[PDB]
């Protein structure tokens, strides 16, 4: 989305780039609107303090990531937005794992999403025998799978989208024998 | 002597099964065990030293105590039916030991790597090293996540034999040449 969150899309950014060369409890709301150009007291406008920023950059970059497009057949191309998403803004989440002990679990949820996407993509494009039990198997099979691994190599700064050729081939061998 | 060890491990075990961890003392150990009391200590200097010779020694031998060409598919069935057995034991122990789980993980990379060694014996395939690594950190922490949030449900770990084979089955086949 663009047009109904112009000026959060604006603060947002401007804490990320911070993030990037800043420690988070160091990084005032002033700071952020500095870095924004935008006047001090519009920050209020929207969020309450850095707290509520965050969550808002998590649920907004993900689902923006995952779920906002226009694809009929998009989840190779979500993932490897994906996995450059979180290389690009890998100090900003090596920050996130140690500050905020719920991330995890946000994280992995995320994970989650991204494969029942992919199940909805696959379903798309070709008839698959695989009953109610067996989807929810797959995608929290994978979704632990990916979260661990790219969790880790977040918090060790090595590079995700190293990892995508593997990973969609993993992904597509496990969707092809329900075929 | 394992004998002694498994009777006492025994005996904690079951103590657990209705008893907080904390509300369990080495004298009800011993007198569940019907062992003399003093006799804990020639084994285990307490409570904590018992719960990680039980897992030391049980997973040791689901993974490394097996013949050689028992193979990996007799060995996962053992661990989810050792899980299963275990399964309120395990609930528990997710609880109270938050460092269980990286053991734990530790325990599916031992299995993925035999994974990985048997197929090699049984067929050819054209994976480079990282590669068979990637497969293998992937699919250890998939396993681990995945069994963990079984015990933790209280659902069947046995029944997920047929799932994670098929899903890891799949895998090794596209690099087999």
Known sequence: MEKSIITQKIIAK?????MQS???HQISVSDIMQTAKIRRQTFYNYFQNQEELLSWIFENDFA???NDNSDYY???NELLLLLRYLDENQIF?????????????FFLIQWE????????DQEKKSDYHWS??????????????I???TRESIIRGNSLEKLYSQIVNLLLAQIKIFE
């Open 93 to 105: 989440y090596q920050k996130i794992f140690v500050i905020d002990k719920n991330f995890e679990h």
């Open 64 to 66: 923006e990531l995952i």
């Open 74 to 76: 998009g989840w190779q």
């Open 147 to 149: 979260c661990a691994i």
């Open 132 to 145: 109610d039990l067996e989807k929810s198997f797959i995608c929290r099979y994978n979704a632990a799978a």
């Open 22 to 24: 800043n420690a988070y």
């Open 113 to 120: 999403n991204l494969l029942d996407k992919v199940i909805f």
């Open 14 to 18: 401007a804490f990320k780039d911070l």
